[model samples]
Target: MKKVMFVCKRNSCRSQMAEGFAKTLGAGKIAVTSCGLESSRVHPTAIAMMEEVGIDISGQTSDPIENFNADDYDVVISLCGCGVNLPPEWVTQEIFEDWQLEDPDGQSLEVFRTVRGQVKERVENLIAKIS
Candidate 1:
């Protein structure tokens, strides 16, 4: 199975949502984990947005990217364009992508939903492309 690391600036919004969707959708096809450049609490809106679509991400922890070795993952994905901030090892991973997804932290619920959809689509594409 492909080991995937989803990253963002805070792991509170975009990255966490991607991890939630990937874990559920990818299932046996991939292993998904999310982190940030700095550790943070998962955004409340993120969990609510995911639950609106039937995926629960309330239990996912927001971790610092430094907690895990970059070499352990086959793909290193930056959901909020934090690619410029990642370590060399992360960028040199087998498949690295700077998704640059929009941040919905203070946005309206509808915007969050839109971002959630975009995340789901991108994640599915990633799964197909990599594995």
Candidate 2:
């Protein structure tokens, strides 16, 4: 199975949601992990958004990308266009994609919901493309 890593600036919003979707939707098909350039707590709204879709991400911890080895993952996804900020090894992964998803941290619930939908669609596409 392919190992996938989802990354962002803080692992707080977009990346967190992508991780949740990948874990549930790509279960058994891939191994997934998420981290940020700098560790930060997962955003409350992000967890709540996933919960709305029946996915529990409350247990997912925010971690620094430095904590993980780039070589360990086959696919590297930068959810907030932070790919440029990642290490050479990370960007050189077998499959690297910068999604550039919108941040919903301080946005309205409507924006959060829209981004959540976009994240879900892209994640599904990624899973299918790699699987």
Candidate 3:
């Protein structure tokens, strides 16, 4: 089994969504997790948007990146472009990638759908690359 970690500014939206999609699509073939640069609560809009697509993230909570050890993952992905401040001299098994996803925190439902679609597409592509 391969471990994949999705990361963003707050682990509240984009990264969480990406993890959800990857987990659903991977169907146990991939071990997926998400975290943020700073710890915070998962956004309500994020939960609502995911529910719109039949993926319930209501039980998921935001987590800080520090809570996880980099060595535990096979891949570490950054979903928000500007939020990444990777540590120097980091020695881990995880290979780092960045998606630089768009923030849909305050966007309308239509915009949220668009962001969700993008996240799903990216996750699918990433899964394909790994699989």
Candidate 4:
């Protein structure tokens, strides 16, 4: 299975949501992890957003990119336009993409839902491409 890392600036929202979608949708097709350039608690809004779609992400934790090795992943995705800030090793992975998804934090519930749907679409496309 392909190993995927969904990274963001804080691992609190976008990347966390992507992880949830990949874990549930990718399942046996791929292995998934999520982290941030720096760690922060998983955003409650992110968890709530996923829950609305019947995918539970409450079990996921926010982690730092520094804690993981770049070689461990087959693909790396940046969710917050932070790709340029990531170490070269991460951006040089076999498959790397910067989705640059908008951060929905502190926004209306509608924004959260919109981003959640976007994450799911991208995740599905990724799985189809590699898994």
Candidate 5:
């Protein structure tokens, strides 16, 4: 299985959403994980928005990027607009990529939906490419 990690500044929204979408949409074909440079609770709006799409992420918790063992993944995708940080010396099968998704913390529901759709589309595209 190919392991993919979605990264962000905080594992609150974008990366978490992307990880959920990839897992559901990818449907076991890929192994997906999400984390942040700094861990924070998953945003309430993010949980609500994902539930609207029939993907429940209420149980998902934030994790620090330091917790990730670079050797465990095949792909590392940065979803936060701020960018991803990876040590150059880690030896693994992982390939690094970046999505640079938008932050939706204070956005309106309509905007959140839009961001959700954008992420879903991107997740689908990534799956198509990888699968």
Candidate 6:
């Protein structure tokens, strides 16, 4: 199984959504976790958007990126295009991608849903490639 990390500026929305989808879609194929450059609550909007796709990530916790060891992961994904801001070893992982998806914090429901769909698509592709 591949160890994957989904990272963002906060563990608020995008990265959290990616973890929820990957856990469900990737299943036995990949081990996944999400974190942020710093810790913050998992914004309510993220839970709502994920619920739209039939996944509940309410039990998930907001964690700092520095909490995990980069050597533990085979893939490191920066959801907000913050790869450039991450430590060098993270980007040098076996697989790394800077998704740079839009932030849906204060946006409308449609915007959140759009990012939700985009995350799902990209995660599906990543799982396929790694599997």
TM per candidate: 0.92, 0.93, 0.89, 0.94, 0.87, 0.93
Clashes of 5: 0
Worst 10 residues of 3 by lDDT: 85-94
1-131 in candidate 6: lDDT tens per residue?
Answer: 78889888878888888899999999999989999887889998888888877998999978988778788799999876544458657787888888888878888999998889999999999999887
For model 6, what is the alpha-carbon lDDT of residue 21?
Answer: 93
For 48-109, candidate 5 gives per-residue lDDT tens digits of 88988899888787898777776677776777775455555223444676666556788688
Quote the lDDT for 15 in model 1.
Answer: 85
TM-score of 1: 0.92
Model 3: per-residue Cα lDDT over 1-131, one tens digit each:
68788878877888888888988898767888888877788988888888888897777889987778777777877776673657741235446777765677777878778888988998898787775
For residues 1-131, what per-residue lDDT tens digits would candidate 4 score against the true structure?
88999888878888888889999999999999889887878988888888888999898878998889888799999887544557669888889888876668778989888888888999999998889
Off by over 4 Å in 3: 88-94
Clash number for each model: 0, 0, 0, 0, 0, 0
- Candidate with the larger lDDT of 3 and 5: 3
- Tens-digit lDDT string for candidate 2 (1-131): 68889888878888778889999999998888889877878888888888899998889878998878899899988876544557578888888888876668788888899989988898899888788
Candidate 2: which pairs clash? none
Alpha-carbon RMSD, each predicted model? 1.5, 1.5, 1.9, 1.3, 2.2, 1.4
lDDT of each: 0.84, 0.84, 0.79, 0.85, 0.77, 0.86
Model 4: worst 10 consecutive residues (lDDT sum): 79-88
Query: Which candidate, 3 or 4, has the higher lDDT?
Result: 4
Score candidate 5 by lDDT: 0.77
Whichever of 2 and 5 has more TM-score, that candidate is 2
lDDT score, candidate 4:
0.85
Superior candidate under TM-score, 1 versus 3: 1
Residue lDDT tens for model 1, 1-131: 78889888877888888888889888888898889887878889888889887999988878997778899899998876544557578888998888876678887998888889988988999988776
Give the lDDT of residue 57 in candidate 2. 88
Clashing pairs in 3: none
